[PDB]
């Protein structure tokens, strides 16, 4: 299970620990070679958050915190937290065979990546621009 | 179930609530921030009653006042309404591994997107935009 | 069933209503953005019309009328008629698994697109350069 | 069944009517009008008796007088004959998911294409062309 | 079975002989002669204990003294050891059709490659190279 | 069965007639339009020859003769012999599902291509730069 919590933009997950967050279907992020850091990318079904992701994109409205979480099917073993997020792309599509989905890309000035070991410690990275 | 209702251009859906609109097979649309860059709306349908009218409006650059696109579960949970539409592309194709189909792309000056929530509606979340 | 009737260039269909016309296997056509109108494209097996499509292509010989028809498997629900046609490409290929086929592209100065409703009216478009 | 007979370069077909010609696995050729632009004729065969001769003629730019390509149902229903041929390309390849094979492309100054009709022949329709 | 042991960056393999190293899912590396052009070494692993450290070293341009990559049948038949490594790329991705994974590419100033032969070891064949 | 014998660089085939040569998994070569002659290309599993192909590549060390042979599954029906060979590329990769493999490309100043007919004669080609 994968979830993303976006300040001011609710989704519709019915998970007990992530109520009203966005269920993530796919994601990616990369960093190359002072480094070149790409937009963070996720996919979700078109849902409650969709019209607000579109507005925020179209306006360049800033989002204070975003939190992305991966859970084993129930340890939340990976957490990435982002600051000063800007929604930079919204891509939607559907066909006749599940619901339509949308891919979102966003920028950020800071991040923290926490990985949780087992129950042992935590290993972490962060970055700033 | 997906429908598009285009002013002046009837389709041939036999759905009770969408009689004579166009049944949509697939669609896509995007927006990116380098003012947003907003793509043409794209959809596919079988070649039908609407096709020759769509081809004319395209060839002539003829404006269309209102277009309404709807997805349904049976809740109509997403509606996108576009204003002042111009048909920018008509691509048709068929093969023995079919009915032939056609992709339509179009311009617009404004749009509204409404997502409708329901509980076991409660409400609608909306966005709108204007060139 | 799909058929194309080309002035002066017979095919070998044994259909009762389209005797000696060309059976079409695939086709496409597109129009974009005064519009940009592409060549009309069809595929057929290499047949009686093939050497004449090749000659006409190689010479730039003009063809007065071409008629393309789609039939439900028997209403002829779509008709496209073209004027002043030029054969602009001939592409042939085969393998070991049905017969070889050939793709033909042609230009035209005019067209009429008739769609037939049911039995009701007709809706039509045309264009000229 | 597909055969190519190339002057001076025997293959190893064991077909009765095409003894010692080259069996063809695939081919293609095209012509487009921007004088027509006419592509090299292309075919594939297994690496065989003809291959090292084909490779020599290519390397040397050696002219070949006549090449005859035939498709058969058993009516030989299409024949293309080429004149003054130059081998412009030899690409060979093999893998454990085989016999290795080789694609050959060639130049020509003239060609004739004959399509033979039969009823339950009646005739032939032909085209020819000359650089 | 494939392992990579990276100085200062533990993984979480539970293999007896490679405890706390990184299990590798796929890799690639090449060298071409136009001094040879030598590519970054590339590998993939599941997102694990090593990932945030790998991401830090990348972001900072932090040098890593020794990296050792091993393939095993159970003979460890190929070992490549690299010296003075810099992490040049970190690409991560997940989907519902999974654990997410991550590709890592890295720089190096020297490497040694040993291939170990055995009979029913007898020996090792080696190559080494230095920028 | 496909084999390649490289001067000074042994492989590990256990075939009786090609003991200690390199088992080839795939190969290709092409010649186009004085002709443009590509590098000869073969794939093999990472094996005894691998570290020496890498060294020779990295040094530009010359190899006097290379012999490539194809055998029916046992007539050796095709032989290509190369002179003054240079290893120009080494590309390795593996995954979780047989062993890793490596692709090798090499240059040469001369070659002879012998094809064996049946038992009849031989047909041959060669080239020099």
From TrEMBL, chains B, D, E:
Top-level taxon of origin: Bacteria
**What is the recorded name of this protein?**
Hcp1 family type VI secretion system effector
Species source reads: Yersinia pestis
Gene designation: hcp1_1
